[PDB]
Amino acid sequence: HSLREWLAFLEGKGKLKRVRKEVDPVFEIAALGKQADGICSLLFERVKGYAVPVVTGLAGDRELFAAAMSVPVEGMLEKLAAAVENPVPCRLVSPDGAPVKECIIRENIDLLKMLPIPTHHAGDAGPYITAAILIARDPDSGVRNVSIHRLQVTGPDRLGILILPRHLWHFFGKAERAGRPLEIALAIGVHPAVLLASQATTRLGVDELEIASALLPQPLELVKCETVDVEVPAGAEIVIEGKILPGVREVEGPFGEYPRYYGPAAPRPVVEVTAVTHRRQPVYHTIIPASREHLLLGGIAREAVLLQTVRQAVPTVKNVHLTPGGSCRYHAVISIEKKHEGEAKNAIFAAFTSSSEVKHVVVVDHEINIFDPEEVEWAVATRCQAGRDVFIVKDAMGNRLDPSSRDGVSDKMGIDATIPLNLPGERFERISIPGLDKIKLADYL
Amino acid sequence: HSLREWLAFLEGKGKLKRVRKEVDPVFEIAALGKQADGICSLLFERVKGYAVPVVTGLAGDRELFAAAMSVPVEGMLEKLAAAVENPVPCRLVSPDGAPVKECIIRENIDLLKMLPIPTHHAGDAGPYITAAILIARDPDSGVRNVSIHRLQVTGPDRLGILILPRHLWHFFGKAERAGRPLEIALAIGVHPAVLLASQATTRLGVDELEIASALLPQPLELVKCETVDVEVPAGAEIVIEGKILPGVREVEGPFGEYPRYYGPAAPRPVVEVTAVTHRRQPVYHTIIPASREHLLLGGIAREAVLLQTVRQAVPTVKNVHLTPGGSCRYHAVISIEKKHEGEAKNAIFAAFTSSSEVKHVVVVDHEINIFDPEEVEWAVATRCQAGRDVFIVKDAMGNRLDPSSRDGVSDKMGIDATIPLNLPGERFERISIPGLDKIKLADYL
Amino acid sequence: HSLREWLAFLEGKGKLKRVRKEVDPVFEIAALGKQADGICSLLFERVKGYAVPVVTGLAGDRELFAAAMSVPVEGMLEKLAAAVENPVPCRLVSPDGAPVKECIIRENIDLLKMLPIPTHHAGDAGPYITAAILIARDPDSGVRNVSIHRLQVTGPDRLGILILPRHLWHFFGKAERAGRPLEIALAIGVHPAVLLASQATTRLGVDELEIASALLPQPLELVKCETVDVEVPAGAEIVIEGKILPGVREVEGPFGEYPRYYGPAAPRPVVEVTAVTHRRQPVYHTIIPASREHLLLGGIAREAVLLQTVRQAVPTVKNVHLTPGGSCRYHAVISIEKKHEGEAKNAIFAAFTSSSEVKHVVVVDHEINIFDPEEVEWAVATRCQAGRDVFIVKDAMGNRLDPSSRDGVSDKMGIDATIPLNLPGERFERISIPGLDKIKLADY
Ligand SMILES: Cc1cc2nc3c(=O)[nH]c(=O)nc-3n(C[C@H](O)[C@H](O)[C@H](O)COP(=O)(O)O)c2cc1C
Ligand SMILES: Cc1cc2nc3c(=O)[nH]c(=O)nc-3n(C[C@H](O)[C@H](O)[C@H](O)COP(=O)(O)O)c2cc1C
Ligand SMILES: Cc1cc2nc3c(=O)[nH]c(=O)nc-3n(C[C@H](O)[C@H](O)[C@H](O)COP(=O)(O)O)c2cc1C
Ligand SMILES: [Ca+2]
Ligand SMILES: [Ca+2]
Ligand SMILES: [Ca+2]
Ligand SMILES: [K+]
Ligand SMILES: [K+]
Ligand SMILES: [K+]
Ligand SMILES: [Mn+2]
Ligand SMILES: [Mn+2]
Ligand SMILES: [Mn+2]
C-alpha cells in the first residue's frame, strides 16, 4: 500500500480526475485544485515547463481518510489512537530494487529545474514544497521523528523552513548549540496513512513511521539515504536529503496558511540539499494550503486526542468534531450522552485542555449530528440561553496565527447546548415523520 | 401570474418533479417532501383516497422568492419594503368566468372527504391545513387583513385555529365581545407573492392583498364570496368560507411547528365552514412545517424589516440574513461596511429591536458572504475575541415556543466578528489565488 | 515489607506512640487519634472490652507515603503512575504458614464480640469498619478488583456497605441481575502501599493487588480464602470473608465522611460474613474519617492523575497538590514554569478535567513551595489581581457531598497567581538571606 496503489483506488472509486490541458505551476494548479476541494483529487498530466505531473487532494473528506487506514469512519479515531499506543517497527530493505533509488542525483542540484513546485497564493514569497514529510534523528538518543513543514524554495540547493517549537525544534536546538548541522530527509509522494501519522501528537520517544506502519496493512519498507544517516520510505516518489544549517537564519515567507491568512515573514532556519532521489517518471504531490486535505490531516489527529481528553471528564462522550469553519483546530463540537447535570461545562474544559488552539466549543446531546452545521446551530438556537449556558474566559493561551489574538493570548468561549436533565421529556422532543428512513424519494420519481 | 403559471415556470426551470406512484396523505407526503426540501417542488399526482393532487415546496430558496417578485435576489428585500409602503389596489371581478367559482358546494360539507389534507408529523393531533391565507375585515372599520394560520380538521365542517395575538386576534376580540361570529375566507393554492405578502408585518390599517398586488406584475383579481362579506382571489384553487365562532374554545393541537418542536395542545377558537368553492381539477397546496418554504415565507418578511432597522443604527449595512439554522427568526447575521469603531455593537442592538424573536446575532464585514455558514463561522473563529467582542443580556423578552425560554423570557447574545478599524491592514488580509474567477475547472477536464 | 515491619519502621523514626491507658472504642479512639493527626500513629494497647489492640494513622503525611513506596517525596507521583502502567503479578502461597490463617473462625461469628470496631463521629449510625480493602472478581471475566468501602456493623454476621458507582458496582450489578450473590473478602491491617494501590484509578481490566506488588520491594504474597473464590494478602492481620446479597437493601448510615460532613442515610447493599481469619494477637487498623491518613490515600492517587492531566495542557508543570483544606479533592494548587503568557488559565482547565471534584484552583510559579499554605497565600496576595487573574464558571458538575452544591451542580473558580511574562522580572524578586541553607540554628 503506497501512493501509486492509492491513486488507483481513488480512480476506481471515481474520486480522481485527470487534467490533460497544460497548466502553469504558478497559481493555476492552486486555482483549479480549490474548485476540486472536497470533491475529488486532481492529477495534472501536463505542467508547463516539466515532464513530471502534479497530484493534489489525495484525501479531501473523512471517509477517504478512514479508507486509508482500512477502517469504517465510525472507528477511525479509535484506530489512530491505537496506532499511537502500539507502534509497529518498519523493515529496512536493500537499496537496489527500492523504487525511490531508481534515479540518484548528487550534483548540480536545481530543485525548481526538476520538480514542478507550485506557487499557491497571491502573497506567497515564492514556490513552496507543501507535502514533504521530514524525517530526522535525535543527535543524542538517535531515535527518529516525522513532521511536515513548509519549505520555501530560496535557491537551486536551498530551502527555508518553518519549525514551530515541537520535536524537530528540540532536535535542531541540540545540534545548533553544539555547532553542528541536523541531518534530515524529505519524502514527497507517500500514502495518506503516512502523512496522517506524521501529525500524530505523542510522547517525545516515539517514531511516527512506526505509527504509520501500524496504520498500513503491511509494515512500511524503508531504505537508507545516500548522504545522511536517515532512512526514508523506499516507495516514495521523491526524496530530498539535506541538512538544517546551524546558526543560519534567512527570511522565509510570507505564506498563505491553514486559517486563510498569511503567515508573516521572518528570519528562520535553512536547509541545504545534498542529494535528490526519485522514481523513474515520478509524481509530485502538493497540498494546497487551507484545502480539506490540509485541514483534515491535522484535524483528525487532533480529534483523536480531543476524544480521549473529553472522555476523561465525561466518560459517556459520543463524538467530537473540529469543524472546517474553525480550520479543524479552533472550533470544537462535542456530543455527549449526558448523565450528570453540569457535564457539558466539564466537557468544554476538557476540550480546552486537548489543545491551546481550541477557542470556541459547543456541546450538544448524543442525538444531534455534529457533522451537520445546521443541526448544531439549531441546537444552539433552541437549547442555549446565554445567561446560564455560555461562559467566557479572558486572556488564556491561544494561537499566534489567529490574528484576533493579542500576541498568542486569546479569550475562550464555551456554549452548553444540551437539554437540562430531569425535565418532562416532551418539551425538547424534536418533531419527526414516521417511516422517513424506510421511504426513499428516488423510488417515487 | 397565478399558481398554475408558477408551476409551469418551475417546470421550465427544472425545479418541479411529479410523483406518479400512489402516496398516503398520512405521513408519506411529508416524508417525501422533506427529501425534496430546498431542491425542488413535488407534485403528487396520485394521493390515496382522492382525485385531487397535492403540491408542496412552491419556493424553497431565496432565488425563487425573488423570481416570484420579478426581481433579482440582491433587490428582493428593497422591493418587499417598497410594496408595503405603496400598496396597490385590487380589482373586483365578476363571479362568472372566475376560476375559483367553477364548483360551488354549500351542503354536506366534509373537508376530509373532498380534499387530500395531509397529516405531517408524528405527534400531530390530526390532519392540518397549512397553506391557507385567511382573509377577514374589521367589524368596525371594515378594512381587511390577511394572515396564515394552521387549521386542524376536527370535523366535516369544523376547524380548530391557532390565532396568535396580532391583527386577526384584534378583529376576533371585537366580534367576540359583541357576541357575534367573525366572517372569514380561506384561500388555498395562490401565487407565492400572495403568501409572502400575508407575512408582511405592518401598521394596523393596511391590506396585504394590496401588498400582494404591488408585488405581482398585474393587479390581483378578486371575487366576492358566496356566504360571507369577504373577497378572495378569483384565481385560487380552493376557497373555504366560514366563521370563527364567538365564546367557543375546543382543544387544538399539538402540532409540529417551525422550530422543529411541537406546539402544545390547548383550548382555542373554532371555525365553522359555510361553503367551499374550487376550480375543476383543483390542486391542493400544503406547506410542510419546518420546510424551507415555511421558514423563508416568514424569514424574508422579517429580513426586510431587519434591514431597515439595522440601517437606522448603521447606515452602511450591506446585508442581513435570518439563518435557517435559527428557523429564520432566532439567529441573525449582519454584514456592515464599518465606518466607526463600535458600530457592530449598535448593529446588534438594532437586530434585537427588529423583533423579540431575535436571540443570537453575529456581525461580520462587508466582504464576508453571510449566506455561507462556513464563511461566517470562519469569521467568528478568527475575528472574535469573546472577552471584548461578545455580550449577553439576561431576561429579555423572547419567544414562547423556544423551549429553552422561561415562559417567553430569554437571554440574548451579540457577537462582533468585524475587524478592528485603523489597523495594519495586512493582518486580516484573507489569502487568495490570482486568476481564480478567470479560470474554470470544467474547461480543463 | 508488611504492616508489622511498617509499625517497627514508624517506631524507629519516632512516629508511633503507644497508649497504655484504657480507652473506649466508642468515641475515645477517634478523639485521641484526631489530636495525633499528621504528627504520629497511635497504637492503643488496651481497648475496653477486648484483647485486640487498635492502630491508627499508619501514614499521616506525604513523606511517610513516599517511604512506604521506597522513594523520595519528589518522585512519589511518578512511581505511583509507573506502578499503574506496569503492574507486577503476585505470588500465590500455601495456606499453612501464612500468618492470616493462624486462627480460622467459621461459626457463631459475632464481629463486635471479637474485634474492637470503633464508633467515630457523633452522628454515626454505629460502629464502622473503615480500613478494609475489599477484593472481588468479575463474575464473567474472573479478573479482580480492590477498593475500600465503609462497612456499618448492623449485626453479628452482617455489614451495610456504601458502593459508589465504579468497579465494585459493575461487578455487583452483574451478580445481582443474574440472581446471585457477589463473593468478597475484606483484608484489614495491610501495608500502606497496598491501601494506596486500592485507590489507584484505572482501566476496568487491572488488578490493584498487582499495582501494590509493583509498589512494594518484593511481590505481594497472597493466599486462597476458606469460603469464597478470592485471594487475600497472606500477611494481613484480619480477613473477613463474605458475600454481598442480591436484591437486599437495608438502611446504612449516616456516617461522618471525608469533607467533615455527614453522608446521608439510605437503603444500600448488605454483606453476610461467612468466615473470619486472623493472626494470633492481631492488630486492628482503623482509619479515622477526615484524618490525614484518610485524605492522603485518595489525595495522592488523584494527584498522580492531576499531574498527568495538567502536563497535557502545560508540559512544563513542576508540581501539583490537592490540599488538606479542600479534603484532598476540592482545592488544587499547581506550580508551573511558565513559558507562554496565558498558560496558567489552561493549567486550571486541565485541573478541572482531572476530576469533577476539583472546585477551586490556584496556579503559582515553579519557585513557590505549594505544600506550604502560607507561601501560596502570599503568592495570591501579591501576584493576583482578581479583575484579570480570576475566573468563575457557573453550574458545572461538582460533588453531591459538598453541601454548598445544588444537587451535585457546582460553580468553579480559577486563580492565576503567576507573575506576568515579559515584564522587568526584578519587580517580583522575592527577598532572601544569603547563606541561609548553609547555616543551621541547632549548631548555635
Ligand atoms: C500541510 C501541513 C503543513 C505543516 N506545516 C508546518 C510548518 O510549516 N511548520 C511547523 O512547525 N509545523 C507544520 N505542521 C505541523 C506538524 O507537521 C505537526 O504539528 C506535527 O505533528 C509535529 O510533529 P512533532 O510533534 O513530532 O514535532 C504542518 C502540518 C501539516 C498537515
Ligand atoms: C406556514 C405558516 C404558518 C403559520 N401559522 C400560524 C398560526 O398557526 N397562527 C398564527 O397566529 N400565525 C401563523 N403564522 C404567522 C402569521 O401568518 C403572520 O405573523 C402574519 O404576518 C400575521 O398577520 P397580521 O400581522 O396581519 O396579524 C404562520 C405563518 C406561516 C408562514
Ligand atoms: C478511607 C476510605 C474510605 C472509602 N470509603 C468508600 C465508601 O464507603 N464507598 C465507596 O464507594 N468508596 C469509598 N472509597 C473509595 C474507593 O476506595 C475508591 O474510590 C476506589 O479507588 C474505587 O475503586 P474502583 O475504581 O476499582 O472501584 C474510600 C476510600 C478511602 C481512602
Ligand atoms: Ca443548555
Ligand atoms: Ca471583533
Ligand atoms: Ca497573575
Ligand atoms: K509528529
Ligand atoms: K400580515
Ligand atoms: K480501585
Ligand atoms: Mn513527534
Ligand atoms: Mn396585517
Ligand atoms: Mn479498579
Q: Can you give the three-state secondary structure of A222-249, one letter per residue?
A: EEECCCCCCEEECCCCEEEEEEECCCCC
Q: Atom 30, ligand 1: which residue's CA is nearest?
A: A148
> Does the CB atom of residue A296 touch ligand 1 within 6 A?
no
Residues of C with CB under 8 A from a CB of A: 309, 312-313, 340-343, 345-346, 349-350, 352-354, 356, 388, 391, 393-398, 407-410, 412
Instruction: State the pairing for strand pair C331-336/C317-322.
Output: antiparallel
Distance from CA of B356 to the nearest CA of A (A): 14
Integer CA distances (angstroms), B231 to B84, B136, B205, in order: 20, 9, 17
* Residue B423 exposed, middle or buried by CB count within 10 Å (0-12, 13-18, 19+): exposed
Please give the backbone phi and psi of residue A185, each rounded to the nearest 5 degrees, phi first.
-140, 140
State yes or no: cis peptide before B254, omega within 30 of 0. Answer: yes
In a mutational test of the pocket of ligand 3, which residue from C148, C161, C202 has the highest number of ligand atoms less than 8 Å from its CB? C148
Please tell me what resolution, in angstroms, this structure has. 2.7
> Does the CB atom of residue A191 touch ligand 1 within 6 A?
no
Neighbours of A26 (CB within 10 A): 17
* Chain B residue numbers touching A295 (CB-CB < 8 A): none
Q: How far is CA A345 from the centre of its chain?
A: 28
Identify whether the C-beta of residue C252 lies closer than 8 Å to the C-beta of residue C162.
yes
C-alpha cell at A327: 480550520
- Judged by CB atoms closer than 8 Å, whether chains meet at A395 and C345 is answered as yes
* Residue B95 exposed, middle or buried by CB count within 10 Å (0-12, 13-18, 19+): middle
In a mutational test of the pocket of ligand 2, which residue from B138, B151, B153, B166 has the highest number of ligand atoms less than 8 Å from its CB? B166
Identify whether the C-beta of residue B98 lies closer than 8 Å to the C-beta of residue B223.
yes
Q: Atom 28, ligand 3: which residue's CA is nearest?
A: C148
- Judged by CB atoms closer than 8 Å, whether chains meet at C410 and A342 is answered as yes
How far apart are alpha carbons B299 and A375 in whole angstroms?
18
3-state SS assignment for residue B259: coil
Contacting residues for B165 by C-beta, under 8 A, at least 6 apart: none
C-alpha cell at C55: 492502630
State the maximum Cα–Cα separation within chain A, in Å, rounded to a whole number: 77
Beta bridge partners of C19: C44
> What element of type H or E holds C146?
strand C144-148
Experimental method, per PDB record = X-ray
Identify whether the C-beta of residue A144 lies closer than 8 Å to the C-beta of residue A206.
no
Q: Atom 13, ligand 2: which residue's CA is nearest?
A: B149
Integer CA distances (angstroms), C307 to A253, C9, C73, in order: 39, 29, 14
Considering Cα of B295, then B296, then B300, then B303, what sign does the dihedral take?
positive
Q: What is the DSSP letter of A441?
A: G
Q: At what angle do helices C76-85 and C208-215 cross, to 10 degrees?
A: 130
Integer CA distances (angstroms), A230 to A222, A352, B239, in order: 10, 37, 83
Give the count of Cβ contacts less than 8 A between chain A and B: 215
> Does the CB atom of residue C109 touch ligand 3 within 6 A?
no
How far apart are alpha carbons B14 and A441 in whole angstroms?
17
Q: Which among A289, A328, A285, A326 is positioned nearest to A305, based on CA atoms?
A: A328
- Judged by CB atoms closer than 8 Å, whether chains meet at A342 and C407 is answered as no
How far apart are alpha carbons C69 and C87 in whole angstroms?
14
Task: Report the chain A residue with the minimal C-alpha distance to residue B376.
Answer: A325
C-alpha cell at A202: 505523542
C-alpha cell at A156: 537551486
Task: Report the chain A residue with the minimal C-alpha distance to residue B262.
Answer: A431
How far apart are alpha carbons B372 and B376 in whole angstroms?
7
State the maximum Cα–Cα separation within chain C, in Å, rounded to a whole number: 77
Q: At what angle do helices B343-354 and B292-313 cross, to 10 degrees?
A: 130
Contacting residues for A71 by C-beta, under 8 A, at least 6 apart: A79
Contacting residues for A293 by C-beta, under 8 A, at least 6 apart: A37, A56, A57, A58, A59, A60, A287
* Residue A103 exposed, middle or buried by CB count within 10 Å (0-12, 13-18, 19+): middle
> Does the CB atom of residue A355 touch ligand 1 within 6 A?
no
How far apart are alpha carbons B225 and B55 in whole angstroms?
25
Distance from CA of B120 to the nearest CA of A (A): 7
A208 labeled binding residue? yes
Considering Cα of C94, then C100, then C104, then C107, what sign does the dihedral take?
negative
How far apart are alpha carbons C432 and B187 in whole angstroms?
90
A117 labeled binding residue? no
Beta bridge partners of C273: C242
Q: How far is CA A355 from the centre of its chain?
A: 15
Residue B271 amino acid letter: V
Contacting residues for C222 by C-beta, under 8 A, at least 6 apart: C90, C91, C92, C93, C209, C231, C232, C233, C234
> Does the CB atom of residue C418 touch ligand 3 within 6 A?
no
> Does the CB atom of residue C410 touch ligand 3 within 6 A?
no
Q: Rounded to the nearest 10 degrees, how much is the dihedral formed by the CA atoms of A21, A22, A26, A31?
A: 0
B380-393 burial by CB neighbour count: b if 16+ within 10 A, else e?
bbbbbbbbebbebe
Place of cell 461578545: B390
∠ CA A421-A423-A424, rounded to 5°: 140
Instruction: State the pairing for strand pair B91-92/C128-129.
Output: unpaired
Considering Cα of C168, then C174, then C179, then C182, what sign does the dihedral take?
negative
Task: Report the chain C residue with the minimal C-alpha distance to residue A394.
Answer: C388
∠ CA C406-C412-C417, rounded to 5°: 155
Neighbours of C190 (CB within 10 A): 26
The number of CA neighbours under 13 Å toward the Cβ of A441 is 17
> Does the CB atom of residue C98 touch ligand 3 within 6 A?
no
Distance from CA of C396 to the nearest CA of A (A): 4
How far apart are alpha carbons C159 and C136 in whole angstroms?
16
Residue C239 amino acid letter: V
3-state SS assignment for residue B255: strand
State yes or no: cis peptide before B246, omega within 30 of 0. Answer: no
3-state SS assignment for residue A15: coil
Distance from CA of C76 to the nearest CA of A (A): 21
Radius of gyration of chain C (CA): 23
Identify whether the C-beta of residue B273 lies closer than 8 Å to the C-beta of residue B242.
yes
Identify whether the C-beta of residue A349 lies closer than 8 Å to the C-beta of residue C352.
yes
Measured in Å, residue A201 CA sits from the centre of ligand 7 at 5
∠ CA C161-C163-C167, rounded to 5°: 135
Q: Which of the ligands is closest to the CA of residue A169?
A: 1
A115 labeled binding residue? no
* Chain C residue numbers touching A409 (CB-CB < 8 A): 341-342
Strand spans (E) along B264-369? 266-268, 270-278, 284-285, 317-322, 331-336, 360-365
Query: Residues near ligand 2 with C-beta < 6 Å?
Result: B 130, 145, 147-150, 162-164, 166-168, 198-199, 201, 287, 294, 297-298
Place of cell 501576584: C383
The number of CA neighbours under 13 Å toward the Cβ of A54 is 31
> What element of type H or E holds B352?
helix B343-354
Q: At what angle do helices B208-215 and B76-85 cross, to 10 degrees?
A: 130
**Helix segments in A47-135, DSSP class H:** 62-68, 76-85, 111-114
- Judged by CB atoms closer than 8 Å, whether chains meet at C353 and A394 is answered as no
Q: Do chains C and B touch (3 or more CB pairs under 8 A)?
A: no
- Judged by CB atoms closer than 8 Å, whether chains meet at C312 and A309 is answered as yes
Radius of gyration of chain B (CA): 23
The number of CA neighbours under 13 Å toward the Cβ of A335 is 15
* Chain A residue numbers touching B383 (CB-CB < 8 A): 403-404
Instruction: State the pairing for strand pair C270-278/C103-105.
Output: antiparallel
| Chain C: touching chains (3 or more CB pairs < 8 Å) | A
In chain A, after which residues is the C-to-N distance over 2.5 Å, breaking the chain?
none
Domain residue spans in chain B?
1-299, 300-445
